PDB file of C-alpha atoms and ligand atoms in Angstrom:
ATOM      1  CA  UNK A   1     -94.753-106.677  78.909  1.00  0.00           C
ATOM      2  CA  UNK A   2     -95.544-102.973  79.420  1.00  0.00           C
ATOM      3  CA  UNK A   3     -98.980-101.593  80.238  1.00  0.00           C
ATOM      4  CA  UNK A   4     -99.740 -98.272  78.576  1.00  0.00           C
ATOM      5  CA  UNK A   5     -99.705 -95.239  80.839  1.00  0.00           C
ATOM      6  CA  UNK A   6    -103.016 -93.749  81.954  1.00  0.00           C
ATOM      7  CA  UNK A   7    -103.569 -90.559  80.015  1.00  0.00           C
ATOM      8  CA  UNK A   8    -106.816 -88.630  80.381  1.00  0.00           C
ATOM      9  CA  UNK A   9    -108.988 -86.221  78.446  1.00  0.00           C
TER      10      UNK A   9
ATOM     11  CA  UNK B   1     -69.002 -94.513  61.620  1.00  0.00           C
ATOM     12  CA  UNK B   2     -67.525 -97.704  60.198  1.00  0.00           C
ATOM     13  CA  UNK B   3     -69.490-100.053  57.950  1.00  0.00           C
ATOM     14  CA  UNK B   4     -72.065-102.296  59.614  1.00  0.00           C
ATOM     15  CA  UNK B   5     -71.426-106.015  59.221  1.00  0.00           C
ATOM     16  CA  UNK B   6     -73.300-109.029  60.592  1.00  0.00           C
ATOM     17  CA  UNK B   7     -70.618-109.408  63.277  1.00  0.00           C
ATOM     18  CA  UNK B   8     -71.251-105.918  64.661  1.00  0.00           C
ATOM     19  CA  UNK B   9     -74.990-106.526  64.763  1.00  0.00           C
ATOM     20  CA  UNK B  10     -74.253-109.711  66.717  1.00  0.00           C
ATOM     21  CA  UNK B  11     -72.133-107.806  69.225  1.00  0.00           C
ATOM     22  CA  UNK B  12     -74.931-105.279  69.781  1.00  0.00           C
ATOM     23  CA  UNK B  13     -77.459-108.047  70.353  1.00  0.00           C
ATOM     24  CA  UNK B  14     -75.175-109.615  72.969  1.00  0.00           C
ATOM     25  CA  UNK B  15     -74.702-106.273  74.703  1.00  0.00           C
ATOM     26  CA  UNK B  16     -78.459-105.727  74.654  1.00  0.00           C
ATOM     27  CA  UNK B  17     -79.023-109.186  76.160  1.00  0.00           C
ATOM     28  CA  UNK B  18     -76.738-108.251  79.043  1.00  0.00           C
ATOM     29  CA  UNK B  19     -78.571-104.969  79.645  1.00  0.00           C
ATOM     30  CA  UNK B  20     -81.821-106.916  79.739  1.00  0.00           C
ATOM     31  CA  UNK B  21     -80.387-109.358  82.283  1.00  0.00           C
ATOM     32  CA  UNK B  22     -79.149-106.554  84.521  1.00  0.00           C
ATOM     33  CA  UNK B  23     -82.543-104.812  84.353  1.00  0.00           C
ATOM     34  CA  UNK B  24     -84.402-107.955  85.449  1.00  0.00           C
ATOM     35  CA  UNK B  25     -82.860-107.580  88.905  1.00  0.00           C
ATOM     36  CA  UNK B  26     -85.741-107.571  91.439  1.00  0.00           C
ATOM     37  CA  UNK B  27     -83.987-104.831  93.420  1.00  0.00           C
ATOM     38  CA  UNK B  28     -84.654-102.359  90.613  1.00  0.00           C
ATOM     39  CA  UNK B  29     -88.416-102.732  90.902  1.00  0.00           C
ATOM     40  CA  UNK B  30     -88.770-101.445  87.315  1.00  0.00           C
ATOM     41  CA  UNK B  31     -92.383-100.664  86.479  1.00  0.00           C
ATOM     42  CA  UNK B  32     -93.719-102.136  83.254  1.00  0.00           C
ATOM     43  CA  UNK B  33     -94.637 -98.749  81.828  1.00  0.00           C
ATOM     44  CA  UNK B  34     -93.352 -96.829  78.781  1.00  0.00           C
ATOM     45  CA  UNK B  35     -90.459 -96.396  78.478  1.00  0.00           C
ATOM     46  CA  UNK B  36     -89.789 -99.984  79.588  1.00  0.00           C
ATOM     47  CA  UNK B  37     -86.259-101.124  78.778  1.00  0.00           C
ATOM     48  CA  UNK B  38     -87.354-104.779  79.124  1.00  0.00           C
ATOM     49  CA  UNK B  39     -89.629-104.276  76.077  1.00  0.00           C
ATOM     50  CA  UNK B  40     -87.546-101.745  74.147  1.00  0.00           C
ATOM     51  CA  UNK B  41     -84.347-103.766  73.734  1.00  0.00           C
ATOM     52  CA  UNK B  42     -86.073-106.985  72.610  1.00  0.00           C
ATOM     53  CA  UNK B  43     -88.277-104.904  70.295  1.00  0.00           C
ATOM     54  CA  UNK B  44     -85.168-103.222  68.892  1.00  0.00           C
ATOM     55  CA  UNK B  45     -83.610-106.643  68.284  1.00  0.00           C
ATOM     56  CA  UNK B  46     -86.779-107.745  66.497  1.00  0.00           C
ATOM     57  CA  UNK B  47     -86.786-104.721  64.195  1.00  0.00           C
ATOM     58  CA  UNK B  48     -83.077-105.128  63.456  1.00  0.00           C
ATOM     59  CA  UNK B  49     -83.888-108.747  62.536  1.00  0.00           C
ATOM     60  CA  UNK B  50     -86.565-107.493  60.172  1.00  0.00           C
ATOM     61  CA  UNK B  51     -84.146-105.051  58.544  1.00  0.00           C
ATOM     62  CA  UNK B  52     -81.427-107.669  58.041  1.00  0.00           C
ATOM     63  CA  UNK B  53     -84.206-109.962  56.890  1.00  0.00           C
ATOM     64  CA  UNK B  54     -85.187-107.676  54.033  1.00  0.00           C
ATOM     65  CA  UNK B  55     -81.583-107.007  53.047  1.00  0.00           C
ATOM     66  CA  UNK B  56     -80.745-110.664  52.461  1.00  0.00           C
ATOM     67  CA  UNK B  57     -77.885-110.702  49.987  1.00  0.00           C
ATOM     68  CA  UNK B  58     -77.914-106.942  49.395  1.00  0.00           C
ATOM     69  CA  UNK B  59     -76.201-106.566  52.771  1.00  0.00           C
ATOM     70  CA  UNK B  60     -73.386-104.454  51.360  1.00  0.00           C
ATOM     71  CA  UNK B  61     -75.929-101.734  50.608  1.00  0.00           C
ATOM     72  CA  UNK B  62     -77.273-101.764  54.163  1.00  0.00           C
ATOM     73  CA  UNK B  63     -73.771-101.629  55.614  1.00  0.00           C
ATOM     74  CA  UNK B  64     -72.920 -98.457  53.694  1.00  0.00           C
ATOM     75  CA  UNK B  65     -76.065 -96.528  54.624  1.00  0.00           C
ATOM     76  CA  UNK B  66     -74.980 -93.499  56.657  1.00  0.00           C
ATOM     77  CA  UNK B  67     -78.005 -93.381  58.959  1.00  0.00           C
ATOM     78  CA  UNK B  68     -77.695 -97.089  59.774  1.00  0.00           C
ATOM     79  CA  UNK B  69     -73.998 -96.750  60.539  1.00  0.00           C
ATOM     80  CA  UNK B  70     -74.681 -93.842  62.887  1.00  0.00           C
ATOM     81  CA  UNK B  71     -77.598 -95.715  64.470  1.00  0.00           C
ATOM     82  CA  UNK B  72     -75.692 -98.950  65.111  1.00  0.00           C
ATOM     83  CA  UNK B  73     -72.703 -97.033  66.471  1.00  0.00           C
ATOM     84  CA  UNK B  74     -74.989 -95.185  68.887  1.00  0.00           C
ATOM     85  CA  UNK B  75     -76.846 -98.362  69.872  1.00  0.00           C
ATOM     86  CA  UNK B  76     -73.564-100.074  70.750  1.00  0.00           C
ATOM     87  CA  UNK B  77     -72.405 -96.942  72.571  1.00  0.00           C
ATOM     88  CA  UNK B  78     -75.604 -96.550  74.603  1.00  0.00           C
ATOM     89  CA  UNK B  79     -75.807-100.226  75.557  1.00  0.00           C
ATOM     90  CA  UNK B  80     -72.211-100.158  76.832  1.00  0.00           C
ATOM     91  CA  UNK B  81     -72.898 -96.928  78.707  1.00  0.00           C
ATOM     92  CA  UNK B  82     -75.809 -98.657  80.434  1.00  0.00           C
ATOM     93  CA  UNK B  83     -73.692-101.677  81.381  1.00  0.00           C
ATOM     94  CA  UNK B  84     -71.052 -99.318  82.779  1.00  0.00           C
ATOM     95  CA  UNK B  85     -73.694 -97.417  84.734  1.00  0.00           C
ATOM     96  CA  UNK B  86     -74.619-100.635  86.541  1.00  0.00           C
ATOM     97  CA  UNK B  87     -71.107-101.685  87.523  1.00  0.00           C
ATOM     98  CA  UNK B  88     -69.961 -98.183  88.474  1.00  0.00           C
ATOM     99  CA  UNK B  89     -73.245 -97.461  90.239  1.00  0.00           C
ATOM    100  CA  UNK B  90     -73.208-100.741  92.127  1.00  0.00           C
ATOM    101  CA  UNK B  91     -75.739-100.902  94.971  1.00  0.00           C
ATOM    102  CA  UNK B  92     -76.814 -97.301  94.291  1.00  0.00           C
ATOM    103  CA  UNK B  93     -78.821 -98.456  91.269  1.00  0.00           C
ATOM    104  CA  UNK B  94     -81.531 -99.560  93.681  1.00  0.00           C
ATOM    105  CA  UNK B  95     -81.727 -96.399  95.781  1.00  0.00           C
ATOM    106  CA  UNK B  96     -84.549 -94.524  94.087  1.00  0.00           C
ATOM    107  CA  UNK B  97     -83.752 -90.856  93.446  1.00  0.00           C
ATOM    108  CA  UNK B  98     -80.036 -91.613  93.124  1.00  0.00           C
ATOM    109  CA  UNK B  99     -78.231 -90.174  90.103  1.00  0.00           C
ATOM    110  CA  UNK B 100     -77.210 -93.622  88.813  1.00  0.00           C
ATOM    111  CA  UNK B 101     -80.860 -94.668  88.813  1.00  0.00           C
ATOM    112  CA  UNK B 102     -82.053 -91.437  87.191  1.00  0.00           C
ATOM    113  CA  UNK B 103     -79.442 -92.033  84.488  1.00  0.00           C
ATOM    114  CA  UNK B 104     -80.940 -95.463  83.782  1.00  0.00           C
ATOM    115  CA  UNK B 105     -84.351 -93.852  83.336  1.00  0.00           C
ATOM    116  CA  UNK B 106     -82.985 -91.248  80.927  1.00  0.00           C
ATOM    117  CA  UNK B 107     -81.327 -94.060  78.945  1.00  0.00           C
ATOM    118  CA  UNK B 108     -84.640 -95.936  78.884  1.00  0.00           C
ATOM    119  CA  UNK B 109     -86.203 -92.858  77.321  1.00  0.00           C
ATOM    120  CA  UNK B 110     -83.343 -92.590  74.832  1.00  0.00           C
ATOM    121  CA  UNK B 111     -83.746 -96.253  73.836  1.00  0.00           C
ATOM    122  CA  UNK B 112     -87.432 -95.470  73.270  1.00  0.00           C
ATOM    123  CA  UNK B 113     -86.691 -92.493  71.003  1.00  0.00           C
ATOM    124  CA  UNK B 114     -84.123 -94.594  69.139  1.00  0.00           C
ATOM    125  CA  UNK B 115     -86.582 -97.419  68.477  1.00  0.00           C
ATOM    126  CA  UNK B 116     -89.187 -94.934  67.254  1.00  0.00           C
ATOM    127  CA  UNK B 117     -86.632 -93.263  64.975  1.00  0.00           C
ATOM    128  CA  UNK B 118     -85.451 -96.604  63.593  1.00  0.00           C
ATOM    129  CA  UNK B 119     -88.997 -97.656  62.730  1.00  0.00           C
ATOM    130  CA  UNK B 120     -89.695 -94.241  61.245  1.00  0.00           C
ATOM    131  CA  UNK B 121     -86.654 -94.508  58.970  1.00  0.00           C
ATOM    132  CA  UNK B 122     -86.914 -98.269  58.357  1.00  0.00           C
ATOM    133  CA  UNK B 123     -90.675 -98.865  58.280  1.00  0.00           C
ATOM    134  CA  UNK B 124     -91.234-102.509  57.322  1.00  0.00           C
ATOM    135  CA  UNK B 125     -87.474-102.968  57.524  1.00  0.00           C
ATOM    136  CA  UNK B 126     -86.659-101.146  54.274  1.00  0.00           C
ATOM    137  CA  UNK B 127     -84.661 -97.895  54.327  1.00  0.00           C
ATOM    138  CA  UNK B 128     -86.866 -94.926  53.476  1.00  0.00           C
ATOM    139  CA  UNK B 129     -85.250 -91.961  55.188  1.00  0.00           C
ATOM    140  CA  UNK B 130     -84.781 -90.312  51.797  1.00  0.00           C
ATOM    141  CA  UNK B 131     -88.553 -90.084  51.394  1.00  0.00           C
ATOM    142  CA  UNK B 132     -89.403 -89.325  55.031  1.00  0.00           C
ATOM    143  CA  UNK B 133     -92.408 -86.998  55.447  1.00  0.00           C
ATOM    144  CA  UNK B 134     -91.654 -83.888  57.504  1.00  0.00           C
ATOM    145  CA  UNK B 135     -94.996 -82.984  59.088  1.00  0.00           C
ATOM    146  CA  UNK B 136     -94.930 -79.176  58.932  1.00  0.00           C
ATOM    147  CA  UNK B 137     -94.723 -77.744  55.398  1.00  0.00           C
ATOM    148  CA  UNK B 138     -92.391 -74.883  56.411  1.00  0.00           C
ATOM    149  CA  UNK B 139     -90.006 -77.198  58.236  1.00  0.00           C
ATOM    150  CA  UNK B 140     -90.064 -79.594  55.295  1.00  0.00           C
ATOM    151  CA  UNK B 141     -88.977 -76.826  52.933  1.00  0.00           C
ATOM    152  CA  UNK B 142     -86.123 -75.821  55.211  1.00  0.00           C
ATOM    153  CA  UNK B 143     -84.752 -79.347  55.356  1.00  0.00           C
ATOM    154  CA  UNK B 144     -84.819 -80.112  51.629  1.00  0.00           C
ATOM    155  CA  UNK B 145     -83.415 -76.692  50.764  1.00  0.00           C
ATOM    156  CA  UNK B 146     -80.494 -77.182  53.137  1.00  0.00           C
ATOM    157  CA  UNK B 147     -79.990 -80.938  53.189  1.00  0.00           C
ATOM    158  CA  UNK B 148     -82.004 -82.174  50.223  1.00  0.00           C
ATOM    159  CA  UNK B 149     -82.982 -85.803  50.811  1.00  0.00           C
ATOM    160  CA  UNK B 150     -80.371 -86.574  53.479  1.00  0.00           C
ATOM    161  CA  UNK B 151     -81.650 -88.584  56.442  1.00  0.00           C
ATOM    162  CA  UNK B 152     -79.080 -87.502  59.015  1.00  0.00           C
ATOM    163  CA  UNK B 153     -76.595 -84.636  59.431  1.00  0.00           C
ATOM    164  CA  UNK B 154     -73.970 -83.742  62.064  1.00  0.00           C
ATOM    165  CA  UNK B 155     -75.092 -81.272  64.746  1.00  0.00           C
ATOM    166  CA  UNK B 156     -72.566 -78.614  63.687  1.00  0.00           C
ATOM    167  CA  UNK B 157     -73.917 -78.836  60.161  1.00  0.00           C
ATOM    168  CA  UNK B 158     -77.502 -78.620  61.419  1.00  0.00           C
ATOM    169  CA  UNK B 159     -76.783 -75.724  63.774  1.00  0.00           C
ATOM    170  CA  UNK B 160     -75.162 -73.623  61.044  1.00  0.00           C
ATOM    171  CA  UNK B 161     -77.997 -74.286  58.605  1.00  0.00           C
ATOM    172  CA  UNK B 162     -80.666 -73.372  61.142  1.00  0.00           C
ATOM    173  CA  UNK B 163     -78.747 -70.307  62.275  1.00  0.00           C
ATOM    174  CA  UNK B 164     -79.100 -68.713  58.832  1.00  0.00           C
ATOM    175  CA  UNK B 165     -82.905 -68.850  59.072  1.00  0.00           C
ATOM    176  CA  UNK B 166     -83.467 -68.704  62.834  1.00  0.00           C
ATOM    177  CA  UNK B 167     -80.517 -66.926  64.489  1.00  0.00           C
ATOM    178  CA  UNK B 168     -79.277 -68.655  67.629  1.00  0.00           C
ATOM    179  CA  UNK B 169     -78.480 -66.064  70.301  1.00  0.00           C
ATOM    180  CA  UNK B 170     -75.493 -67.738  71.962  1.00  0.00           C
ATOM    181  CA  UNK B 171     -73.360 -70.775  72.647  1.00  0.00           C
ATOM    182  CA  UNK B 172     -75.325 -71.620  75.791  1.00  0.00           C
ATOM    183  CA  UNK B 173     -78.624 -71.361  73.899  1.00  0.00           C
ATOM    184  CA  UNK B 174     -77.139 -73.541  71.146  1.00  0.00           C
ATOM    185  CA  UNK B 175     -76.271 -76.186  73.735  1.00  0.00           C
ATOM    186  CA  UNK B 176     -79.790 -76.028  75.208  1.00  0.00           C
ATOM    187  CA  UNK B 177     -81.254 -76.399  71.707  1.00  0.00           C
ATOM    188  CA  UNK B 178     -79.037 -79.368  70.956  1.00  0.00           C
ATOM    189  CA  UNK B 179     -80.060 -81.167  74.156  1.00  0.00           C
ATOM    190  CA  UNK B 180     -83.726 -80.587  73.264  1.00  0.00           C
ATOM    191  CA  UNK B 181     -83.519 -81.787  69.636  1.00  0.00           C
ATOM    192  CA  UNK B 182     -80.887 -84.526  70.029  1.00  0.00           C
ATOM    193  CA  UNK B 183     -83.390 -87.106  71.282  1.00  0.00           C
ATOM    194  CA  UNK B 184     -81.050 -90.023  70.530  1.00  0.00           C
ATOM    195  CA  UNK B 185     -78.113 -88.170  72.123  1.00  0.00           C
ATOM    196  CA  UNK B 186     -75.714 -89.054  69.304  1.00  0.00           C
ATOM    197  CA  UNK B 187     -74.527 -85.572  68.240  1.00  0.00           C
ATOM    198  CA  UNK B 188     -76.367 -85.976  64.938  1.00  0.00           C
ATOM    199  CA  UNK B 189     -79.777 -84.673  63.889  1.00  0.00           C
ATOM    200  CA  UNK B 190     -81.937 -87.070  61.894  1.00  0.00           C
ATOM    201  CA  UNK B 191     -84.794 -85.924  59.687  1.00  0.00           C
ATOM    202  CA  UNK B 192     -86.940 -87.834  62.212  1.00  0.00           C
ATOM    203  CA  UNK B 193     -85.666 -85.832  65.212  1.00  0.00           C
ATOM    204  CA  UNK B 194     -86.016 -82.657  63.165  1.00  0.00           C
ATOM    205  CA  UNK B 195     -89.650 -83.495  62.483  1.00  0.00           C
ATOM    206  CA  UNK B 196     -90.429 -84.115  66.153  1.00  0.00           C
ATOM    207  CA  UNK B 197     -88.825 -80.867  67.282  1.00  0.00           C
ATOM    208  CA  UNK B 198     -90.520 -78.771  64.614  1.00  0.00           C
ATOM    209  CA  UNK B 199     -93.932 -80.283  65.340  1.00  0.00           C
ATOM    210  CA  UNK B 200     -93.583 -79.752  69.109  1.00  0.00           C
ATOM    211  CA  UNK B 201     -92.445 -76.160  68.718  1.00  0.00           C
ATOM    212  CA  UNK B 202     -94.447 -75.011  65.699  1.00  0.00           C
ATOM    213  CA  UNK B 203     -95.167 -72.582  64.150  1.00  0.00           C
ATOM    214  CA  UNK B 204     -91.889 -72.619  62.220  1.00  0.00           C
ATOM    215  CA  UNK B 205     -92.118 -68.871  61.602  1.00  0.00           C
ATOM    216  CA  UNK B 206     -91.252 -68.250  65.261  1.00  0.00           C
ATOM    217  CA  UNK B 207     -89.652 -71.631  65.996  1.00  0.00           C
ATOM    218  CA  UNK B 208     -86.899 -70.582  68.410  1.00  0.00           C
ATOM    219  CA  UNK B 209     -88.996 -67.922  70.102  1.00  0.00           C
ATOM    220  CA  UNK B 210     -91.603 -70.640  70.705  1.00  0.00           C
ATOM    221  CA  UNK B 211     -88.958 -72.988  72.107  1.00  0.00           C
ATOM    222  CA  UNK B 212     -87.514 -70.259  74.297  1.00  0.00           C
ATOM    223  CA  UNK B 213     -90.898 -69.418  75.840  1.00  0.00           C
ATOM    224  CA  UNK B 214     -92.061 -73.043  76.266  1.00  0.00           C
ATOM    225  CA  UNK B 215     -88.833 -74.707  77.387  1.00  0.00           C
ATOM    226  CA  UNK B 216     -85.858 -72.410  77.991  1.00  0.00           C
ATOM    227  CA  UNK B 217     -87.564 -69.958  80.324  1.00  0.00           C
ATOM    228  CA  UNK B 218     -90.610 -72.023  81.320  1.00  0.00           C
ATOM    229  CA  UNK B 219     -90.473 -73.681  84.758  1.00  0.00           C
ATOM    230  CA  UNK B 220     -93.088 -76.243  83.770  1.00  0.00           C
ATOM    231  CA  UNK B 221     -91.006 -77.887  81.021  1.00  0.00           C
ATOM    232  CA  UNK B 222     -89.396 -81.196  81.963  1.00  0.00           C
ATOM    233  CA  UNK B 223     -86.654 -82.392  79.605  1.00  0.00           C
ATOM    234  CA  UNK B 224     -86.296 -86.180  79.301  1.00  0.00           C
ATOM    235  CA  UNK B 225     -88.915 -87.021  81.938  1.00  0.00           C
ATOM    236  CA  UNK B 226     -91.223 -90.053  81.793  1.00  0.00           C
ATOM    237  CA  UNK B 227     -94.873 -90.392  82.732  1.00  0.00           C
ATOM    238  CA  UNK B 228     -93.968 -91.969  86.078  1.00  0.00           C
ATOM    239  CA  UNK B 229     -91.409 -89.258  86.876  1.00  0.00           C
ATOM    240  CA  UNK B 230     -93.982 -86.538  86.191  1.00  0.00           C
ATOM    241  CA  UNK B 231     -96.495 -88.216  88.516  1.00  0.00           C
ATOM    242  CA  UNK B 232     -93.807 -88.608  91.182  1.00  0.00           C
ATOM    243  CA  UNK B 233     -92.727 -84.963  90.832  1.00  0.00           C
ATOM    244  CA  UNK B 234     -96.281 -83.644  91.251  1.00  0.00           C
ATOM    245  CA  UNK B 235     -96.891 -85.647  94.448  1.00  0.00           C
ATOM    246  CA  UNK B 236     -95.482 -82.893  96.668  1.00  0.00           C
ATOM    247  CA  UNK B 237     -98.082 -80.578  95.142  1.00  0.00           C
ATOM    248  CA  UNK B 238    -101.001 -82.964  95.666  1.00  0.00           C
ATOM    249  CA  UNK B 239    -102.589 -80.376  97.975  1.00  0.00           C
ATOM    250  CA  UNK B 240    -102.004 -77.548  95.517  1.00  0.00           C
ATOM    251  CA  UNK B 241    -104.505 -78.015  92.662  1.00  0.00           C
ATOM    252  CA  UNK B 242    -103.436 -76.229  89.506  1.00  0.00           C
ATOM    253  CA  UNK B 243     -99.825 -77.324  89.886  1.00  0.00           C
ATOM    254  CA  UNK B 244     -98.627 -78.610  86.512  1.00  0.00           C
ATOM    255  CA  UNK B 245     -95.608 -79.627  84.426  1.00  0.00           C
ATOM    256  CA  UNK B 246     -95.231 -80.832  80.830  1.00  0.00           C
ATOM    257  CA  UNK B 247     -92.905 -82.923  78.655  1.00  0.00           C
ATOM    258  CA  UNK B 248     -92.568 -84.836  75.389  1.00  0.00           C
ATOM    259  CA  UNK B 249     -94.951 -87.782  75.250  1.00  0.00           C
ATOM    260  CA  UNK B 250     -92.906 -90.952  75.026  1.00  0.00           C
ATOM    261  CA  UNK B 251     -95.468 -93.084  73.115  1.00  0.00           C
ATOM    262  CA  UNK B 252     -96.919 -90.262  71.001  1.00  0.00           C
ATOM    263  CA  UNK B 253     -93.603 -88.831  69.840  1.00  0.00           C
ATOM    264  CA  UNK B 254     -94.152 -85.358  68.492  1.00  0.00           C
ATOM    265  CA  UNK B 255     -96.944 -84.527  70.924  1.00  0.00           C
ATOM    266  CA  UNK B 256     -96.993 -83.030  74.407  1.00  0.00           C
ATOM    267  CA  UNK B 257     -98.083 -84.605  77.701  1.00  0.00           C
ATOM    268  CA  UNK B 258     -99.227 -82.206  80.421  1.00  0.00           C
ATOM    269  CA  UNK B 259     -99.401 -83.435  83.995  1.00  0.00           C
ATOM    270  CA  UNK B 260    -101.483 -81.604  86.578  1.00  0.00           C
ATOM    271  CA  UNK B 261    -103.018 -81.805  90.047  1.00  0.00           C
ATOM    272  CA  UNK B 262    -106.821 -81.576  90.048  1.00  0.00           C
ATOM    273  CA  UNK B 263    -109.031 -80.051  92.727  1.00  0.00           C
ATOM    274  CA  UNK B 264    -110.303 -83.515  93.671  1.00  0.00           C
ATOM    275  CA  UNK B 265    -106.859 -84.895  94.479  1.00  0.00           C
ATOM    276  CA  UNK B 266    -105.915 -86.668  91.255  1.00  0.00           C
ATOM    277  CA  UNK B 267    -102.738 -86.298  89.215  1.00  0.00           C
ATOM    278  CA  UNK B 268    -103.662 -86.614  85.553  1.00  0.00           C
ATOM    279  CA  UNK B 269    -101.686 -86.352  82.346  1.00  0.00           C
ATOM    280  CA  UNK B 270    -103.278 -85.301  79.093  1.00  0.00           C
ATOM    281  CA  UNK B 271    -102.072 -85.010  75.509  1.00  0.00           C
ATOM    282  CA  UNK B 272    -103.363 -81.832  73.804  1.00  0.00           C
ATOM    283  CA  UNK B 273    -104.913 -82.182  70.345  1.00  0.00           C
ATOM    284  CA  UNK B 274    -105.788 -79.712  67.573  1.00  0.00           C
ATOM    285  CA  UNK B 275    -103.909 -76.940  69.357  1.00  0.00           C
ATOM    286  CA  UNK B 276    -100.219 -76.117  69.818  1.00  0.00           C
ATOM    287  CA  UNK B 277     -98.881 -76.197  73.372  1.00  0.00           C
ATOM    288  CA  UNK B 278     -99.208 -72.403  73.490  1.00  0.00           C
ATOM    289  CA  UNK B 279    -103.000 -72.465  73.276  1.00  0.00           C
ATOM    290  CA  UNK B 280    -103.293 -75.542  75.477  1.00  0.00           C
ATOM    291  CA  UNK B 281    -101.364 -73.787  78.251  1.00  0.00           C
ATOM    292  CA  UNK B 282    -103.297 -70.527  77.915  1.00  0.00           C
ATOM    293  CA  UNK B 283    -106.692 -72.228  77.927  1.00  0.00           C
ATOM    294  CA  UNK B 284    -105.594 -74.431  80.806  1.00  0.00           C
ATOM    295  CA  UNK B 285    -104.611 -71.363  82.829  1.00  0.00           C
ATOM    296  CA  UNK B 286    -107.919 -69.605  82.185  1.00  0.00           C
ATOM    297  CA  UNK B 287    -109.884 -72.732  83.111  1.00  0.00           C
ATOM    298  CA  UNK B 288    -107.877 -73.006  86.321  1.00  0.00           C
ATOM    299  CA  UNK B 289    -106.141 -76.303  85.519  1.00  0.00           C
ATOM    300  CA  UNK B 290    -102.610 -75.126  84.679  1.00  0.00           C
ATOM    301  CA  UNK B 291    -101.890 -72.433  87.248  1.00  0.00           C
ATOM    302  CA  UNK B 292     -98.616 -73.225  89.006  1.00  0.00           C
ATOM    303  CA  UNK B 293     -95.718 -74.428  86.790  1.00  0.00           C
ATOM    304  CA  UNK B 294     -93.763 -76.987  88.813  1.00  0.00           C
ATOM    305  CA  UNK B 295     -95.734 -75.718  91.801  1.00  0.00           C
ATOM    306  CA  UNK B 296     -94.526 -72.132  91.495  1.00  0.00           C
ATOM    307  CA  UNK B 297     -96.963 -69.303  92.244  1.00  0.00           C
ATOM    308  CA  UNK B 298     -96.043 -67.292  89.153  1.00  0.00           C
ATOM    309  CA  UNK B 299     -97.082 -68.636  85.743  1.00  0.00           C
ATOM    310  CA  UNK B 300     -95.380 -67.466  82.528  1.00  0.00           C
ATOM    311  CA  UNK B 301     -97.561 -65.219  80.394  1.00  0.00           C
ATOM    312  CA  UNK B 302     -97.492 -66.649  76.874  1.00  0.00           C
ATOM    313  CA  UNK B 303    -100.431 -64.570  75.652  1.00  0.00           C
ATOM    314  CA  UNK B 304     -97.831 -62.482  73.854  1.00  0.00           C
TER     315      UNK B 304
HETATM  316 MG1   MG C 401     -79.643 -87.255  67.379  1.00  0.00          MG
END
């Protein structure tokens, strides 16, 4: 299953 | 396209199963990150099951729906294209940076946009494209005035309608526009794709001028690129903080994802909020974060 991509803020 | 019958849906499922099998090949080394074809196809199957599920008996109605016919035709077409890519690409499918491999990634993105569109038109499995909510008021008015409650229209038809309100400068610009808006690459424009485009390039009042400045002439724009491709592309600029590029977010369809190299050696990607790309880019420049589009020394001046 896919792991969400690491976005930042 | 022709009417959709149970048989056809079966054929698509079988073709999807084969794509899944091919993509499980260890040589591919596919990362489990959005867009992940190994999730997308099974998830598409599941939602198609749900749709059929809620159209028990009243299948004739489902089969005649224009959007659904276009969608199923495209699904079958894209799955076959993917299978062909593998056989014609042969051993080159495993050589990263090869065209055949890049094509698989683009298809993965397309499958992602297709699943999102399907769920947006068939939320809970029941057709609701006729009541779809276009996010920007101005865009919404344009669509109902020109296409009423239609869910999908041919590109030619869309182009001509838009042209009357936002003149398209040329054939080449028209083609660029089409490739930007036609997320499902099926030569049609759904109310869903229309919504995404108009939200990304708002305000509607200067729609095409916005698109021209942010994508047609902007070196930072990356059409059909994934999160992993953006990170990979910025690697060569790891020692050049301020280098940045941007693209459509794949999991937050309708929003932007900006990738950039920080002064401390990290490559981050952020999704702007409460501010159109225009302001995000301008503020980012001033704060020293978005200085070099695709690593280039000159940055477009959008403050105009
Ligand atoms: Mg389309």
